[PDB]
Amino acid sequence: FSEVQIARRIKEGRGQGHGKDYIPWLTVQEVPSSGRSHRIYSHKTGRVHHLLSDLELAVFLSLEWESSVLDIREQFPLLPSDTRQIAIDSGIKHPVIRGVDQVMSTDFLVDCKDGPFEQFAIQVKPAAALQDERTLEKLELERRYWQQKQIPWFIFTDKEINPVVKENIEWLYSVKTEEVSAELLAQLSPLAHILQEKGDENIINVCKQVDIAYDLELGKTLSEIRALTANGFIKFNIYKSFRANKCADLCISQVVNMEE
Ligand SMILES: [Cl-]
Numbered sequence: 395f396s397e398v399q400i401a402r403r404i405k406e407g408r409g410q411g412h413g414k415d416y417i418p419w420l421t422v423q424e425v426p427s428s429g430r431s432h433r434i435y436s437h438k439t440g441r442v443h444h445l446l447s448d449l450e451l452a453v454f455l456s457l458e459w460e461s462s463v464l465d466i467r468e469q470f471p472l473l474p475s476d477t478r479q480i481a482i483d484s485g486i487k488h489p490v491i492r493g494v495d496q497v498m499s500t501d502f503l504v505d506c507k508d509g510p511f512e513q514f515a516i517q518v519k520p521a522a523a524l525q526d527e528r529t530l531e532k533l534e535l536e537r538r539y540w541q542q543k544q545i546p547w548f549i550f551t552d553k554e555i556n557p558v559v560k561e562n563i564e565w566l567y568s569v570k571t572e573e574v575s576a577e578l579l580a581q582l583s584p585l586a587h588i589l590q591e592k593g594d595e596n597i598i599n600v601c602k603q604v605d606i607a608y609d610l611e612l613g614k615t616l617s618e619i620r621a622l623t624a625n626g627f628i629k630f631n632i633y634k635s636f637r638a639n640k641c642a643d644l645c646i647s648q649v650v651n652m653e654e
């Protein structure tokens with residue numbers, strides 16, 4: 395993936411800062427195989443995050459939903475000196491590509507406000523991947539790294555995905571719209587007001603009502619919300635089908651094109 399030039403990526407700030415200032419070590423451009431990547435906005439961090447698979451997306455959405463989560467720093471880099479030492483102490487070949495030892499990274503490093511632990515890490519991997527010896531070795535390197543720092547670490551796989559969350563993702567990500575036009579975002583403020591007053595009403599009813607009110611073709615507003623939701627500008631109760639969500643279950647943001 396990366397040559398000795400990694401030194402420059404380190405200078406770019408990759409892996410430093412937090413909130414809107416945090417820069418992932420890996421970005422969507424570093425996505426392998428058919429594995430689809432995602433750039434979703436976060437209300438908590440105020441920035442767009444890079445997820446490298448649908449599984450990671452599912453985890454991110456769960457994190458963004460949690461009230462106790464304060465920050466989500468995805469693709470977090472593990473200090474090379476620490477990982478080389480661990481590789482040595484364990485007798486495991488530190489990740490190498492063409493002789494250059496690679497910089498390892500945990501999928502998510504998250505901070506909390508009142509959970510059991512103020513900070514914890516997560517590695518996302520499909521259950522099947524654990525049947526490969528090399529993956530296990532790499533996972534041990536990662537496990538030890540966090541253990542060394544007394545930060546709880548966990549592995550999240552597909553069988554940890556709530557079925558409802560799963561179907562919600564299947565509805566939101568059959569790629570409908572990705573065009574984040576200033577005009578699409580313009581709909582955030584108006585939509586926020588409507589949803590706020592029609593709070594206790596089912597999201598689908600309110601959607602039809604708006605279509606009628608403004609004389610839009612049936613489904614227009616649902617399509618808009620579906621797009622703003624899939625992009626992270628709108629958050630909802632992922633543990634409940636979107637269609638069963640009340641308007642009060644949705645949360646809209648103040649995001650403007652100043653996302654550079
Ligand atoms: Cl994955």
Ligand SMILES: [Mg+2]
Pocket residue numbers: 499500501
């Ligand atoms: Mg990773």
Ligand SMILES: [Mg+2]
Pocket residue numbers: 501517518519
């Ligand atoms: Mg992974």
